[PDB]
Amino acid sequence: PRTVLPFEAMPQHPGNRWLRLLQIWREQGYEHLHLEMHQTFQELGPIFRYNLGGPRMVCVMLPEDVEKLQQVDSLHPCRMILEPWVAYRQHRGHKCGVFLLNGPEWRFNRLRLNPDVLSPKAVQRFLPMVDAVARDFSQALKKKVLQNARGSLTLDVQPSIFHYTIEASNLALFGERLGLVGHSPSSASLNFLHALEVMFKSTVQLMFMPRSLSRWISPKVWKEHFEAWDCIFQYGDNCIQKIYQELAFNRPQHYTGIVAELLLKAELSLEAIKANSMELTAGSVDTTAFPLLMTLFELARNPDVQQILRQESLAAAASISEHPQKATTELPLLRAALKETLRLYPVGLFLERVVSSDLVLQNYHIPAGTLVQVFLYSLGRNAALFPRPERYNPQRWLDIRGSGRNFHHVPFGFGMRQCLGRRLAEAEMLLLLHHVLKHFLVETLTQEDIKMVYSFILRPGTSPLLTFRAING
Amino acid sequence: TVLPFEAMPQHPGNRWLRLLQIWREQGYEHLHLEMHQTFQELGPIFRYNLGGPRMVCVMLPEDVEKLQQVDSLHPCRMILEPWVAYRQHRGHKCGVFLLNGPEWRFNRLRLNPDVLSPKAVQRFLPMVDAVARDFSQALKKKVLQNARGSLTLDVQPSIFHYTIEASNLALFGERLGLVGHSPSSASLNFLHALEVMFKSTVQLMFMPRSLSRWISPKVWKEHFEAWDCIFQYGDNCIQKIYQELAFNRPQHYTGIVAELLLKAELSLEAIKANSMELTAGSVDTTAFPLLMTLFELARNPDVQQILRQESLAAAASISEHPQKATTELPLLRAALKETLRLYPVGLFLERVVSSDLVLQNYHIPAGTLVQVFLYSLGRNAALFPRPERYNPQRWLDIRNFHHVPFGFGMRQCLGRRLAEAEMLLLLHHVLKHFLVETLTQEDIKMVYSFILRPGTSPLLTFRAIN
Amino acid sequence: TVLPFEAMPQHPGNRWLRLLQIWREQGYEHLHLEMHQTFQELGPIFRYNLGGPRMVCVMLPEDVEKLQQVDSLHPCRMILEPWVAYRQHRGHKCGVFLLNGPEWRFNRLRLNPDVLSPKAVQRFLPMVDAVARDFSQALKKKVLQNARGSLTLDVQPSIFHYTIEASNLALFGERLGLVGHSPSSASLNFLHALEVMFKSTVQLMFMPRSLSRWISPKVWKEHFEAWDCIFQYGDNCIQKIYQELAFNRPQHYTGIVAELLLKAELSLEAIKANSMELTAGSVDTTAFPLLMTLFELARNPDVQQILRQESLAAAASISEHPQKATTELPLLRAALKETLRLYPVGLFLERVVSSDLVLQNYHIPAGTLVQVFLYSLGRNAALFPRPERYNPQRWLDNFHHVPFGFGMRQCLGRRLAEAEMLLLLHHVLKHFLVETLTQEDIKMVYSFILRPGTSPLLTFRAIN
């Protein structure tokens, strides 16, 4: 006859919003947030409350509490809206994308976005496009590799992977090749990458304090943040202005990208398409690129795992060449290697929901209005949910059909508000890795675990030196 | 009966208020719209208060006819003091634009056979054609890599690198590798140097050296630093061809400047001066009406398709004989006449008249500067029916002096024929492979910065024809 | 009757006036002309007032022959204090140039078989040849696009990117893609780092650590920042090959450094140190006499055509077997000897003598620094008739040719530099005529190495 306890009975985080914000001002970031939160779960248990003074905040981990959170997902799930991002759009007179929307406005936008961005039918249309970029990546790498006497190229792949994600995402969204794969990076691509870096750095700085504090504590950080958005929006509008003009004179019969479908359907206003198209263009660069580099590293660290994946990719090489759409079903262990990477290195770190109805999490009453934050780092590294958590084991995802481990894999979220660019990111990662495995051996002397850094998204601190050795002629 | 010079409507402006506005705004970007409004208010003729020197402003072709008859064996122009100041300073000879009297005529008569003449045009036409061919080829390559089989972009950077490439090949017989590749540091710094020099020319153009030396001392340094980059690029070209020709005198045609150096009718210093005037002079002037033709064809698809049909039928004869492009493409030649009617890069035709004359029944004395305004002339509804209508056919239906964007007589633009060939051939190869399109259906705001240039470059879609 | 050390003519200038001009002018650009004048006015031998330490300046090959006879098992060099200072600071081992005694001999004998030896030269010769072939091929492409079938340019940037490419391929078996393409940020920053290091070497060289600490404190930072860039580029090179070889030991030849790492006769730290000396050392040194050969051939068309006829006849055998380039081209090898006679990159040969010796009938005691001046030596009218004449034939008609030094301590990159020069020149002569109106001698500038002040405008005219 176990009694449900009140919200206040919950272990409280030893910290405070004030020390945190002064420290964030001093250090100009919160690079150690994941290790601070991870330690607190190791000390306080699977559930703890954060003292935001007035607002209630619950920190959870464990699929257990994710299932219950999905149960309370209303027809309009809520998320703690990102004030500095909203501040920019309100300033320059822009509409908000799905991520920065809540309530009916979010649902209207999402339902018109899902069929052309997330849906399986859409994935079958852009899969061959993404495949062509992935094919061009390995073929350019092969060209560089064969010019060296040892038939291998040792390098920092990070710059190439970013220019791959920019190229593949541009082709999938707009049906336009930027010429960044296999060539020198452009001023446009480098300034965009840098603008995204500055935007996230300044997001972390203006994030954990009210506009009443950040207006005088960090006035320079606001200008810095808005200048970063000015560059992000310059690049993004250039994209949309090109496709909008092209489609105005000729409505193509064939598939020419995601955004072409949205503009042709005209279910959303030009302003709403512009807003959501901006979220997709900018959003697909830093997010897909970091777990891709981590998969390449983890495979260079685990040659045993790498060779299992290579054998799969080489056997299924023929069918995928004919129908690139087969890559989804034909490569289970490579799909599972991405699940393993997103467990160890979750680039999204948290799943947040301002809960709309009272609920019970870990025998504590969580009232309506509480912001429930699921910590994907602690959830993934938990030894009880994942045996030998530190082991890179893609096999742990194969025979879990009826293991009740449905909520073990949540790096893209859950329900209606789950990541829109989930399917596009997965396709970009699968296909790059498939074509790399077919032609090269990934190697490294850097066996040491990479220190992750929190800069809005969980990114590695250092990029390791990866050797790409040619297999065949 | 005959009205005095003073009886003329006078411009409401001031020789000082304009001088201070140029000081404050660092340019006179709206000069064309200011002059156009004044003709709409004061009539076809008005005088400008220069506070001593006489200045007349005209806009009629009957006055353009009166001005050519009073042109001497040595036509006179108001010499550009800041440009002359730089050449005096660094010890350079003056090119045909900055010369007057016998020195101009000696230089011009040795320049015309190799630069302007029809026989010269037949020699560099195949050279220019190769660059134009390489432009569309590179554009096609970029276009075909996109899913919609089209490339929407700001063409302005490409068109400038085309004019630099085509002009370099025509003058020096040297490919710079700017067409279909990434712009070089040399080309970008040259383009920028030209923009500054043009900007700083306007800033010192309307005030005497006596005022501009203490009012705008930084603008003089800025202007001379700009010329230092322009002359650095130009001399590099000259010292390459001069060394190449010193060891081997080629049998075949290897450019305009090669002919001038081989003939040796003009001193090395005179060739250097005029060669500088051709290299620098061909980059911006040709590029602006080319972009305007591309835009005007993207807003007039009806006109564009008429030109395309002409270019596609005459495609074969121009492929075997590029020199046939001149006679085989009349409508496309007339479309350029139409770009220059509405968008005159030269804006004005100036002459310091040598003898008294009577323009619009007003006495214009000798020594009076006569300034023809090409913007207003081309926008006169009586001379050009529906003047704000891109109708290249209006140059075919003809039943004289209506087309003067390059000037008239002996002093007419020395680059007229090379510029025409560069425009005519780029457009021919673009029409054969692409459809030019734009949602920007609004007239571009033109900017005066010594030459009439567009303020904004529109977004042009180049759709592959098949 | 042998005279004492003190009886020798003394250099007129004091060490302090020289030290103050190096402070003021931020270099010693006229050193070669100052030393040349002193040999002209004093004789073939003169001592330098170091205010205690003994220093002898020689210019005759008869004296080189003698300086060699005392060399000993471990020849001693006047160690370059600012270079050693950087290594000691960042915790690096010293390369064979900055080493002395047994440590130098241990390093040298493990380096000679894979860097200097004839068997090694036969292994990297085809590699270097491929880069030289790519250079002329790229130049031909640019040349043929011009109406006069010629390209007039400043070759200096291309020659430097050739030496960087060829040396990288020979040492690491890696193509950087610098030949026939646009220069990279890595290559430009490296070139600039080497320039700043050689300039700040001269600035800190002629004064001790004590004076340079307060006279030129900014110059030390400048010098160490330059080395930081040189070492960044060099470690990137070695980190790549070390990782590649760790997973696969290649059966075929994949460069000089691959052999050193596979043999593992030297410690990783010693390989790192010597590999740094080879990577950085092969850029400026080889590039300056190469540009000087191209210039001297553009002013001597008569000599150029003699070399062209040789290169065109021997074109077939060198195409099949590139390793034949060494023996098949005697006049072209002699043209390099001729360029290094007039324009010696490494102006001096220095030795701190371990035993007493006699030079020009003067007693030179043990401990004495003996500096051979290669500029005056190669400009002596008695050893070389009509010395100003660029005549490679003189080398065909006994210590006369010593631009790489002598004995055990002679230039390690001597045979790699020769191969890089010979082959580039062979492929240029085959396809182009080198021409110039600049018929005036280039003013040389001492910047640790003897480099030209100005790069002339050279026309490369296609033959067919």
Ligand code: HEC
């Ligand atoms: C195409 C752009 C894009 C890419 C690529 C992308 N995302 Fe997202 N993601 C979104 C959008 C849009 C949302 C907003 C969800 C909403 O409110 O509808 C989102 C939301 C999320 C959320 C929170 C969802 C929730 O239920 O709270 C997570 C976690 C997430 N993304 C993780 C990722 C990860 C992991 C990757 C790749 C490694 C990724 N995303 C790549 C567009 C992107």
Ligand code: HEC
């Ligand atoms: C290759 C060089 C070059 C090009 C290209 C060039 N010009 Fe000229 N232009 C000149 C020179 C030189 C003069 C001076 C001629 C003289 O005094 O003998 C000149 C003079 C003029 C004049 C004054 C002529 C007069 O009679 O007063 C006008 C107007 C003119 N150019 C218009 C143009 C236009 C319009 C274009 C292109 C659409 C153009 N020019 C392109 C070299 C050039």
Ligand code: HEC
């Ligand atoms: C691959 C690198 C490399 C290149 C290229 C190179 N050197 Fe050397 N050089 C060295 C090294 C290493 C030493 C040190 C030799 C020692 O201490 O044993 C050296 C030493 C020398 C010495 C002193 C020899 C002595 O006995 O005193 C001279 C002289 C010299 N080099 C001249 C040259 C000249 C001239 C060139 C170019 C034309 C050149 N080097 C190119 C690596 C190089």
Ligand SMILES: Cn1cc(C(=O)N2CC(Oc3cncc(N4C(=O)c5ccc(Cl)cc5C4(C)C)c3)C2)cn1
């Ligand atoms: C306490 N805290 C909350 C968060 C948080 O809300 N998120 C989601 C972040 O990761 C993400 C996952 N997917 C896409 C993203 N995006 C981007 O990277 C991006 C860039 C520019 C725009 Cl205009 C929109 C986006 C979106 C939002 C689309 C972020 C992690 C981080 N820390």
Ligand SMILES: Cn1cc(C(=O)N2CC(Oc3cncc(N4C(=O)c5ccc(Cl)cc5C4(C)C)c3)C2)cn1
């Ligand atoms: C009240 N006012 C008079 C003018 C005027 O004199 N002109 C002529 C300007 O247009 C032009 C036409 N053709 C060639 C040109 N050139 C250039 O663009 C150019 C650039 C560098 C040099 Cl070193 C020489 C020239 C020349 C002069 C050759 C200009 C318009 C402008 N405003």
Ligand SMILES: Cn1cc(C(=O)N2CC(Oc3cncc(N4C(=O)c5ccc(Cl)cc5C4(C)C)c3)C2)cn1
């Ligand atoms: C009174 N004085 C002595 C000298 C002197 O010792 N030398 C040798 C200099 O020329 C040379 C010949 N060969 C190779 C060289 N190198 C370089 O250029 C170089 C550059 C960077 C490094 Cl990390 C090592 C080297 C080495 C040392 C390899 C220099 C001239 C100069 N002035």
